[PDB]
Amino acid sequence: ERPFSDILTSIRYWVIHSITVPSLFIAGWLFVSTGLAYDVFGSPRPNEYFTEDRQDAPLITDRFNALEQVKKLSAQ
Amino acid sequence: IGTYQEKRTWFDDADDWLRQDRFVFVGWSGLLLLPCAYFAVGGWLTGCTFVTSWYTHGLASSYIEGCNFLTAAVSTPANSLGHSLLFVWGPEAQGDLTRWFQLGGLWAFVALHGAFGLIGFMLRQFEIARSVNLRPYNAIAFSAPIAVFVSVFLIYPLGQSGWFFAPSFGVASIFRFILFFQGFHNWTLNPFHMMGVAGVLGAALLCAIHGATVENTLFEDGDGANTFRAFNPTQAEETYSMVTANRFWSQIFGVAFSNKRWLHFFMLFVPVTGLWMSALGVVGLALNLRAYDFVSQEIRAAEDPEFETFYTKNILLNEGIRAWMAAQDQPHEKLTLPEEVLPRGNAL
Amino acid sequence: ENTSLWARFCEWITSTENRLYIGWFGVIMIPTLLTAISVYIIAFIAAPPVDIDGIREPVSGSLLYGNNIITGAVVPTSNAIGLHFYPIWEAASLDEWLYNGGPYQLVVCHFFLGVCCYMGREWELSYRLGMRPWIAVAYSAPVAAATAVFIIYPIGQGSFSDGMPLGISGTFNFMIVFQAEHNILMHPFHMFGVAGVFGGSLFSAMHGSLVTSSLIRETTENESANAGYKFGQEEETYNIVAAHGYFGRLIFQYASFNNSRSLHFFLAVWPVVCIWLTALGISTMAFNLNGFNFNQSVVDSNGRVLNTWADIINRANLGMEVMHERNAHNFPLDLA
Amino acid sequence: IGRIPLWLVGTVVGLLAIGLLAIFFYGSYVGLGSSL
Amino acid sequence: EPGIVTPLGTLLRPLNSEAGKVLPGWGTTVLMAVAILLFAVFLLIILEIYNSSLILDGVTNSWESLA
Amino acid sequence: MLTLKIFVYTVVTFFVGLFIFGFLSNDPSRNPGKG
Amino acid sequence: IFTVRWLAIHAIAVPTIFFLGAITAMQFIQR
Amino acid sequence: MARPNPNKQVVELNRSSLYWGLLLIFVLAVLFSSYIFN
Amino acid sequence: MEALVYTFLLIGTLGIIFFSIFFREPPRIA
Amino acid sequence: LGHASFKDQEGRELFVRRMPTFFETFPVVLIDKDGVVRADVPFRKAESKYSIEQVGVSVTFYGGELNGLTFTDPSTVKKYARKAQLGEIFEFDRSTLQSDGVFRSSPRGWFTFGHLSFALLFFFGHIWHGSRTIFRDVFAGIDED
Amino acid sequence: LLCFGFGAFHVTGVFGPGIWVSDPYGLTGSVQPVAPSWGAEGFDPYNPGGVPAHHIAAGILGVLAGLFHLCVRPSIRLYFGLSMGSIESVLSSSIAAVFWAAFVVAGTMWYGSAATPIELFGPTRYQWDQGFFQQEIQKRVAQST
Amino acid sequence: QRVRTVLDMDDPAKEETVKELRKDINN
Amino acid sequence: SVTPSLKNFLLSLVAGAVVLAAIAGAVTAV
Amino acid sequence: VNILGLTATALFIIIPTSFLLILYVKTAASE
Amino acid sequence: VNILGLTATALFIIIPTSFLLILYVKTAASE
Numbered sequence A: 001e002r003p004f005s006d007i008l009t010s011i012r013y014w015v016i017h018s019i020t021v022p023s024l025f026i027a028g029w030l031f032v033s034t035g036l037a038y039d040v041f042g043s044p045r046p047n048e049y050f051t052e053d054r055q056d057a058p059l060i061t062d063r064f065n066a067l068e069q070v071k072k073l074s075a076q
Numbered sequence B: 001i002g003t004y005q006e007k008r009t010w011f012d013d014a015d016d017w018l019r020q021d022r023f024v025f026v027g028w029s030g031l032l033l034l035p036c037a038y039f040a041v042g043g044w045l046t047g048c049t050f051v052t053s054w055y056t057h058g059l060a061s062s063y064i065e066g067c068n069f070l071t072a073a074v075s076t077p078a079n080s081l082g083h084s085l086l087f088v089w090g091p092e093a094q095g096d097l098t099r100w101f102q103l104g105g106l107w108a109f110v111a112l113h114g115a116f117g118l119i120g121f122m123l124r125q126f127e128i129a130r131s132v133n134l135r136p137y138n139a140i141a142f143s144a145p146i147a148v149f150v151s152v153f154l155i156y157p158l159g160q161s162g163w164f165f166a167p168s169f170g171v172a173s174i175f176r177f178i179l180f181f182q183g184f185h186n187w188t189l190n191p192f193h194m195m196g197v198a199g200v201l202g203a204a205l206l207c208a209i210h211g212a213t214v215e216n217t218l219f220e221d222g223d224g225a226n227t228f229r230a231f232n233p234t235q236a237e238e239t240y241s242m243v244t245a246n247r248f249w250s251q252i253f254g255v256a257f258s259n260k261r262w263l264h265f266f267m268l269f270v271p272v273t274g275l276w277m278s279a280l281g282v283v284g285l286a287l288n289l290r291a292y293d294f295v296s297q298e299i300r301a302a303e304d305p306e307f308e309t310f311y312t313k314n315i316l317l318n319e320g321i322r323a324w325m326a327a328q329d330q331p332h333e334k335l336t337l338p339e340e341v342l343p344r345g346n347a348l
Numbered sequence C: 001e002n003t004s005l006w007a008r009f010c011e012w013i014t015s016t017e018n019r020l021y022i023g024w025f026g027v028i029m030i031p032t033l034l035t036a037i038s039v040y041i042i043a044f045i046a047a048p049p050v051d052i053d054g055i056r057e058p059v060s061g062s063l064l065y066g067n068n069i070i071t072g073a074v075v076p077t078s079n080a081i082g083l084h085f086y087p088i089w090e091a092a093s094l095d096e097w098l099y100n101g102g103p104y105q106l107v108v109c110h111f112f113l114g115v116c117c118y119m120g121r122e123w124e125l126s127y128r129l130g131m132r133p134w135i136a137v138a139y140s141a142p143v144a145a146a147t148a149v150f151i152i153y154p155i156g157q158g159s160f161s162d163g164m165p166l167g168i169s170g171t172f173n174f175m176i177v178f179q180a181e182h183n184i185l186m187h188p189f190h191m192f193g194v195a196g197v198f199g200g201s202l203f204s205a206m207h208g209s210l211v212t213s214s215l216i217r218e219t220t221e222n223e224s225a226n227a228g229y230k231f232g233q234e235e236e237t238y239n240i241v242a243a244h245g246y247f248g249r250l251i252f253q254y255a256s257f258n259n260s261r262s263l264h265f266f267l268a269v270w271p272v273v274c275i276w277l278t279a280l281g282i283s284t285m286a287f288n289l290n291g292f293n294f295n296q297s298v299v300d301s302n303g304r305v306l307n308t309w310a311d312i313i314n315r316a317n318l319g320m321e322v323m324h325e326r327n328a329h330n331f332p333l334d335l336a
Numbered sequence D: 001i002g003r004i005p006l007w008l009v010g011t012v013v014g015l016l017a018i019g020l021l022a023i024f025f026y027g028s029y030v031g032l033g034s035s036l
Numbered sequence E: 001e002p003g004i005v006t007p008l009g010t011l012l013r014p015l016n017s018e019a020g021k022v023l024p025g026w027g028t029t030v031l032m033a034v035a036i037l038l039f040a041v042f043l044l045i046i047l048e049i050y051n052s053s054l055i056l057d058g059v060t061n062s063w064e065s066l067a
Numbered sequence F: 001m002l003t004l005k006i007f008v009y010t011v012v013t014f015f016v017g018l019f020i021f022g023f024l025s026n027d028p029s030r031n032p033g034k035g
Numbered sequence G: 001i002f003t004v005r006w007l008a009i010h011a012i013a014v015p016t017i018f019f020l021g022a023i024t025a026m027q028f029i030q031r
Numbered sequence H: 001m002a003r004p005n006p007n008k009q010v011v012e013l014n015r016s017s018l019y020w021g022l023l024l025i026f027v028l029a030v031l032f033s034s035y036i037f038n
Numbered sequence I: 001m002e003a004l005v006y007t008f009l010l011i012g013t014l015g016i017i018f019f020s021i022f023f024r025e026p027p028r029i030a
Numbered sequence J: 001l002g003h004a005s006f007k008d009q010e011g012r013e014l015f016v017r018r019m020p021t022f023f024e025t026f027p028v029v030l031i032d033k034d035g036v037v038r039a040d041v042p043f044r045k046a047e048s049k050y051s052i053e054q055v056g057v058s059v060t061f062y063g064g065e066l067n068g069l070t071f072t073d074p075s076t077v078k079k080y081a082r083k084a085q086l087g088e089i090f091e092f093d094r095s096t097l098q099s100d101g102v103f104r105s106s107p108r109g110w111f112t113f114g115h116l117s118f119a120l121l122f123f124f125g126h127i128w129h130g131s132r133t134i135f136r137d138v139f140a141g142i143d144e145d
Numbered sequence K: 001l002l003c004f005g006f007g008a009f010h011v012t013g014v015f016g017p018g019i020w021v022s023d024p025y026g027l028t029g030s031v032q033p034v035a036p037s038w039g040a041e042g043f044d045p046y047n048p049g050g051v052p053a054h055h056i057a058a059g060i061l062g063v064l065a066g067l068f069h070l071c072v073r074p075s076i077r078l079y080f081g082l083s084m085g086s087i088e089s090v091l092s093s094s095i096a097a098v099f100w101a102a103f104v105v106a107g108t109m110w111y112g113s114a115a116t117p118i119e120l121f122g123p124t125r126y127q128w129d130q131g132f133f134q135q136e137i138q139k140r141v142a143q144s145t
Numbered sequence L: 001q002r003v004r005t006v007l008d009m010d011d012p013a014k015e016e017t018v019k020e021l022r023k024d025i026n027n
Numbered sequence M: 001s002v003t004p005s006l007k008n009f010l011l012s013l014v015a016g017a018v019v020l021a022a023i024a025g026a027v028t029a030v
Numbered sequence N, O: 001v002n003i004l005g006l007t008a009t010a011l012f013i014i015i016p017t018s019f020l021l022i023l024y025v026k027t028a029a030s031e
Ligand code: CLA
Pocket: H028, H029, H030, H032, H033, H036, J106, J107, J110, J111, J112, J114, J115, N008, N009, N012
């Protein structure tokens, strides 16, 4: 192929990656900072771990209606 | 194939490309290994970064919740889900990916993809050894990690009430799993686990000893003070005196290896045998068939208030572990135990 | 001069023709280890119960007092003695010496001297044989671990009663109480030790499998493949090039060891340095430095504690903690 | 082919890695998961 | 030298007389693969029924099926 | 007990003296090397 | 590009840098 | 093949393997005897 | 009774060790 | 012996929390209809608030050999609650076989254990024999060329 | 042939005695003839009717596949790939099938099925975990109250 | 006949009972 | 007749066939 | 138990020891 | 008795049988 030390010492590599790598870093930063991570993965924000109805940890306690119950127990 | 016509099909082209030597060998086993292993590793990283365990365990378990590398885990589903496969299209998630993440389906995703990735990696060992015409002892040795993974992450929760009691993929969750086995099974007292510990510790000893014995019985073979430059890969003769190694260890420890073959095999044999014994013990624990108590000593302790052994002390410690762990560790049991029933010592 | 008494004694001691080498490290190793072995066997069989906690509640330990091989142990020295030296001649009677855990102290001191002189003896035989001397350096890691569990942890905690009991269930008791008081699982040095033992198993199996896979055909199928190796043969019995090629195709090309010298070093160094680290972890938790404490680290916007796996571990640790030495504590803090 | 030295590349990469590790260690004492 | 001749061995001899007889090419390998994938689908069906990941009308999947 | 202490002190002193004067007895000269 | 080497590198590297940016952003979340 | 069976093979067990087997048997007995006697 | 069995098993293991050390098959250099 | 119904001085009905499968030992806890713990057998019989003596728990048996009988003494209420922790309460003849008072396993449990262990060992055997078949020509060693 | 005969004559009671069948709560079990279940309920694990239907259908398929393997010779590619000239290949595949079956029977015995009655093998752990008999007893007490 | 009463009566003895684990999204 | 679980199972079979075709196309894309 | 465990231990000692001794004595007479 | 006679009979069978089998197997290996 072509040695890794060959590619990593070339300036074409670095003019490609000085713009690709920070773009991915900023994309991850904005994914966290916009709340899109919370929206995609369902993790609660620090203020919405408890509601005014339940003040303890949720319990799924149901299998065939688990979707409906996690909808009820989640942050609306 | 035996000077036969062997007219080519698409299979021959596929095999020619799959078994071509590149930076990452794919092979026919790559089509199973690379997707499954990639998805398992990426799913574990994704769960430890973003996915919570707030609904299945009542726990914060991701970096986005404030956990670190030690305390983040892809956690098992809730015990009420039982041994459900937690398909994203399954009757629990029903296509909703976010609620599938919240319900613990990522654990089943990672576990099943990791199991099939282990199968693919063993098949990769087989395929590469067959390509280079070596004996398949690497795959035979890798059978023991797969036995451990199967018995621990699949057979044990399948014997229990649900995936909830499987280990959660994470550092502190594995520590939870270990302390749970101590308190609830007395897993140290299990002879199969004792054989497993003996195999692991003896294999670490064998690795260290060997390596030290080879590095200290080296032939000169050079002129410089750096011995690592005095070995060529195409060298025909040995690099270490087996005779001097044998003399040293016979006069130090009483016995020594005289056969290099037998030594390398023994180094193969000890950890594989230990891990297989521990896997059999975990299979026993899947059905709560524990080596928990010595009934004669329990009888003597019940009929004699003076009789105390370290085994009786460990039984007391396990009782404390179970009583103080149960309410937070098994929320589905809904144990609201008053402190007056918690076993305690004095003052402390 | 081969006739003077001291020279004859010296040439016998340093002889590389004795079945087991003695050497000058051996002239201390053999009597101390024989003393420790004798006392350990006798105590394990027939020792009377030992008041380990110093609370006049003795622990039996020996087979003749109703223990099996698993639960039998030589019980550590009484907490009333602490770190005081307790030889037989410092007891009024052998019965008092036995009641207060003297056999444990005797065996531990003699075993420490014996393993230090075993390490020195390994160096001495390597020097007498014209070898290189660092097998003793490799052996220093289990010696460090034994010293940590039998001497250094009692020194840090103030009492030989905190030493690891010379037994199986006693070892388990030591582990559980150690986790309860120090959170050794969450200690990075112990994590390094676990990585070392797991990696030692992995690398032993891999070496092994690799050498075994690349064995040169010298035998038939009705013989043992080991019969293809002769003791003292000059030629290599395996294809290091083929094994390295297999490993490179299996994982990565340039990440594979192309030097057997370098591979053996790696095999030597990895479990040894990791056992060094975990022995030092035990020795540092002797002075109560402890593992990572992440209890109530995660809190919500209102400040309510969000429990983690660390909190579950803490619940288990509390369960062990409120139960160990159930009658030995008069004050709430476990400072001693 | 060879324009920027590989040792300089590795030094810059290691500096960035050490900086990220220092940021992660700083984040253990601030914000979420910091006990405060 | 020949083996031991028995009447039953003579009777059974045609059933062990075609060792090493193979078809050229791939033969019925495609049909075998179709059968294998159908069997895999069937095993997945029964696994999901007995796992309660597949819910059917008359399949109770409990001890009440004994009723 | 004092007799036991005297005997043990004699034994330990004997073995330690053997160790000390054994390494005093030109020990760096007792090796198969050249030099 | 589009080789097995390139794809195997990028399937690890691109999510790694994305996740590192994400975790670095998480370090500055003041609850 | 012929009147004698041609697949005759001679089993071998050297002293090191005897010591390993005896050690395995006695160590298994030591380990499991406490549990068997219970 | 059981103490006899435990002691016998331990002593037999030590005897096997003694024999494996001092009555080993000697490594032959040919 | 019949079903054991527990009541307090106030007359509300209490139920013993049944022992889960994991627990070798389980604390005795008596819970009301609405999920509130109302009585227990405390480990710490000092500054306790829910002991059988304090709450005044009696037990009445229905349907068995103790049908119609009511017990009010705490020493017997404690033992019947500890037995009700295990489910329905039975009387056991232990002198015939010299039973040691510790639970055994069922034939289905022994069958499952034996067959799961055999299944893993046979997975290893299948690996070994597939290896032997595929790698037969290198079983005694590699070609050296 | 043997599977078909066992399913069509033994377990159906046409010529043999049938198999053990019980009520869901293990009270009135006996060896009875069993009608096959040819619908989706035939794949109910706890349905006794699944056993004759499975054995009849699988025996017919085994007879047809055996006729196929009597007739049709293997291909050269698959013959060399699976080493059909070596008995150790057959041993490896047989060991694979046998531990697959061992896992199946271990899971079936542990979770319960129509072929593992509680009157013969004892209750399962999940009947205690999920309150099977407790629920039935309390429902029978709530009725007639 | 009173499924609510038999539910609230099986619940304190055993919280893992399938009557408690079934159709409790309505609760 | 067809439950939602059965419909999702059949769609999952379709998706599995799709991803096998996709990995075959990735193999032949070289 | 006290005596059934005794016969179990004795048989587990003796029968494999018998097997090993048979094979070893045969081998040592062969060589 | 029921069990001590059992172990006596088992040992009296197995130990001389082991001795005889050792001697016979070495002899038969020596033809
Ligand atoms: C698949 C195998 C299998 C299964 C699941 C069962 C199951 C059962 N049998 Mg059984 N049996 C079997 C095969 C099996 N058996 C065979 C092959 C024999 C002929 C030897 C027997 C002979 C037999 C007798 C004579 C009796 C039983 C009884 C029992 C029942 C009591 C529990 C038990 O097994 O004892 C407990 C089982 C164990 C403790 C298993 C030991 C765990 C392993 C093997 C130890 C590991 C090996 C170790 C290195 C050995 C070293 C020990 C040494 C130091 C002494 C149980 C229902 C008893 C009963 O109730 O009769 C009505 C009884 O008395 N069976």
